[PDB]
Amino acid sequence: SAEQVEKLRNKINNAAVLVFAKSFCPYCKKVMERFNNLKIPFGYLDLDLKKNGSDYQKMLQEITGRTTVPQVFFRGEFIGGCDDVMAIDDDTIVKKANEMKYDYDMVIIGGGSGGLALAKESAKSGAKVALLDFVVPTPMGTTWGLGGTCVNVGCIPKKLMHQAALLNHYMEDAKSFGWDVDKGPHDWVKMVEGIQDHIHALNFGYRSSMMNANVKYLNALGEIVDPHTIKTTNKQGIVKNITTNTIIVATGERPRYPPIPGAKEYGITSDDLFTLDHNPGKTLCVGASYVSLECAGFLSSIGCDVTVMVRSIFLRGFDQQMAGLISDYIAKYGVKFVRPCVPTSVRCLEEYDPESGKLAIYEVEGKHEDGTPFKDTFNTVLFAVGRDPCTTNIGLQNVDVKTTNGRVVVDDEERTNVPNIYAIGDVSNAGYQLTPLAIQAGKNLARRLYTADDCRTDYTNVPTTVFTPLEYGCIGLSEENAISKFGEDNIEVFHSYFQPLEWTVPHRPDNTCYAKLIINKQDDNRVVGFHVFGPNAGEVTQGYAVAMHLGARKEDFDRTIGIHPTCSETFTTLRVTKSSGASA
């Protein structure tokens, strides 16, 4: 109440056409059917499916002065109950439900994972919405279609290359299983065509979706001029201001290059790798982030001579034991590491020649800490250091939207310091930079803006997985972080090394695959961390995220019967602790 009433007023006004409803109520039917008949796009909320739905009933009477539902609004103007909507003509209602002020209800800057999702979901609940997306090309020249980082230049192409890499070992395994296989060379270009086919079908599918939902896809660069107007600047060079009630920033990030001679003019990044014409050849990856080690990982298994140059430690921010095991493995099966090193120069000794099939060579220099010098020669330098949020150049200075470390600061409804400017997915200072989280952020905001719902998105207990040659999934805290957060005295860690059955016949190292649970003994042996290293870590791990949201404890895993034979059953049977010292 009081504070709550005003929160609902604010949603009603900033919505479009909006019907408060109930399942078992007859009249709400009538109104909605009429709105469908006149192509009037709206967005309902069934108070019956809420359980704080009572508050709403009473809150709405504060606002409108009417007792029952249905209760209709046209962008903040109360239109009335059922008998009120019917007294307005077939022509003049359609007119009334379009009175706008602004060109759009929502303009979305960026058509990535989050933008696209926010966009489709808001149009479903009646908003007139514009989606800006423009891919500023890479220093090298590269560009892609609609869909964002994941679709074009991340998750999708990344996991496909990985699968190509995983098959390499699967074929070596198949001889143990009785198959006579020789297997031949790997043609890089044939892979990249079928990858780039799939990305093109997704480019198309997303463009199609926006079109079928009445989202105006504008292929142009957005920039804020003030809280209700953005400046669009298109492929040609044109300019064109458009107005809007709500602005959503959703511009993602881009690869960071370090500040050294040759970085931009001779290196490449993830943006370029997935669309490369030729074999990358003898390749060097600079950085120990997830992008670097995944890329390194699948290039090596594809045949390439990979070297990874690490500044200090691997996967800063992930559990350092597990990072250890990721690197160790990667290293056992071919990836050469150079550590600690940062590169200092990139210089071009030779040219690439399509006339007539033969790769460029670059001399890279580095300081080997103490330091001896580093100097070696590669065909590809791949910078996989970090990624920078896309917040310079969008006019954030004009509205003074607050930032930190470059990320747009936001509250728990994804809103900035200026109350009609929201930000979602990677640019925000909420959460891990992941696609499903960009998506859900946006799906839920759509429902708050244009159905007046209170559903917020939960940024705790987020699962993640790194697709290294052997995969690492994790939820919750690292061991170090749980330790330092809850105290050494209050955490027990359960662990076990094990072997998938699928590896016993092919004689691949035993006790490499590994599982640990982090336990906060003080809070009823709550699971506060989950870590798995092995094949299909992503699958193994997804389901335990739900159990964690429901507050799983150790006894909750042990009462669960396992599935056999599976890698994931090991979590139902864990006994050895780290404090015991017993071998795992």
Ligand X SMILES: Cc1cc2nc3c(=O)[nH]c(=O)nc-3n(C[C@H](O)[C@H](O)[C@H](O)COP(=O)(O)OP(=O)(O)OC[C@H]3O[C@@H](n4cnc5c(N)ncnc54)[C@H](O)[C@@H]3O)c2cc1C
Contact residues for 530 (Cβ-Cβ < 8 A; gap 6+): 473, 474, 475, 476, 517, 518, 541, 544, 548, 571
Do 322 and 329 form a contact (C-beta atoms < 8 A)?
no
CA 351 – CA 361 distance, rounded (Å): 7
Q: Is 534 in the site for Au ion (CB under 5 A)?
A: yes
Do 470 and 534 form a contact (C-beta atoms < 8 A)?
yes
Question: Looking at 97, 309, 513, 527, which residue binds Au ion (CB under 5 A)?
Answer: 513
Q: How, if at all, do strands 129-132 and 104-109 pair?
A: parallel
Q: Is 218 in the site for Au ion (CB under 5 A)?
A: no
- State yes or no: is 564 an active-site residue: yes
Q: Using CB under 6 A, which of the segments 250-258, 366-374, 502-510, 545-553 binds ligand X?
A: 250-258
Q: Which residues are annotated as a binding site for FAD?
A: 111, 113-114, 133-134, 149-150, 158, 222, 290, 426, 435, 564
526, interface contact from Au ion, ligand X, none, CB < 5-8 Å by kind: none
Distances (CA, A) of 33 to 12, 18, 139, 400, 496: 21, 14, 53, 43, 59
Write the interaction track for ligand X spanning residues 94-123; mark x where CB under 6 A is met and - where it is not. ---------------xxxxxxx--------
Q: Which is nearer to ligand X, 433 or 536 (CB)?
A: 433
**Residue 127's closest CA among 188, 10, 216, 58?**
216
567, interface contact from Au ion, ligand X, none, CB < 5-8 Å by kind: Au ion
Contact residues for 77 (Cβ-Cβ < 8 A; gap 6+): none
Q: Is 425 in the site for ligand X (CB under 6 A)?
A: yes
Q: Is 112 in the site for Au ion (CB under 5 A)?
A: no
Residue type (1 letter), 241: N
Question: Looking at 165, 410, 430, 438, which residue binds ligand X (CB under 6 A)?
Answer: 438
Torsion of CA 28, 34, 38, 40, to 10 degrees: -10
Residues 439-498 that bind ligand X (CB under 6 A): none
Write out the two tokens for 67. 């007792």
| DSSP H/E element including 195 | helix 188-212
Q: Which is nearer to ligand X, 72 or 408 (CB)?
A: 408
**Residue 324's closest CA among 491, 531, 485?**
531
Write the interaction track for Au ion spanning residues 185-204; mark x where CB under 5 A is met and - where it is not. --------------------
Q: How far is the CB of 471 from Au ion (least distance, A)?
A: 10
251, interface contact from Au ion, ligand X, none, CB < 5-8 Å by kind: ligand X
Q: Which is nearer to Au ion, 226 or 502 (CB)?
A: 502
Residues 560-579 that bind Au ion (CB under 5 A): 567
Residue type (1 letter), 207: R
Do 416 and 409 form a contact (C-beta atoms < 8 A)?
yes
Distances (CA, A) of 287 to 73, 310, 423: 53, 5, 28
- C-alpha 308: how far from its chain's center? 25
534, interface contact from Au ion, ligand X, none, CB < 5-8 Å by kind: Au ion
Q: Which is nearer to Au ion, 84 or 502 (CB)?
A: 502
Q: Is 114 in the site for Au ion (CB under 5 A)?
A: no
191, interface contact from ligand X, Au ion, none, CB < 5-8 Å by kind: none
**Residue 113's closest CA among 396, 443, 405?**
443
Q: Is 414 in the site for ligand X (CB under 6 A)?
A: no
Q: Is 17 in the site for ligand X (CB under 6 A)?
A: no
Q: Which is nearer to Au ion, 286 or 513 (CB)?
A: 513
Q: Is 276 in the site for ligand X (CB under 6 A)?
A: no
Q: Give me the active site residues, please.
A: 564
Residues of the shown chain interacting with Au ion in the complex, contacts defined by CB under 5 A: 500, 513, 534, 567
Residues of the shown chain interacting with ligand X in the complex, contacts defined by CB under 6 A: 109-115, 132-135, 148-150, 154-155, 158, 221-222, 250-252, 270, 291, 390, 394, 425-426, 433-436, 438
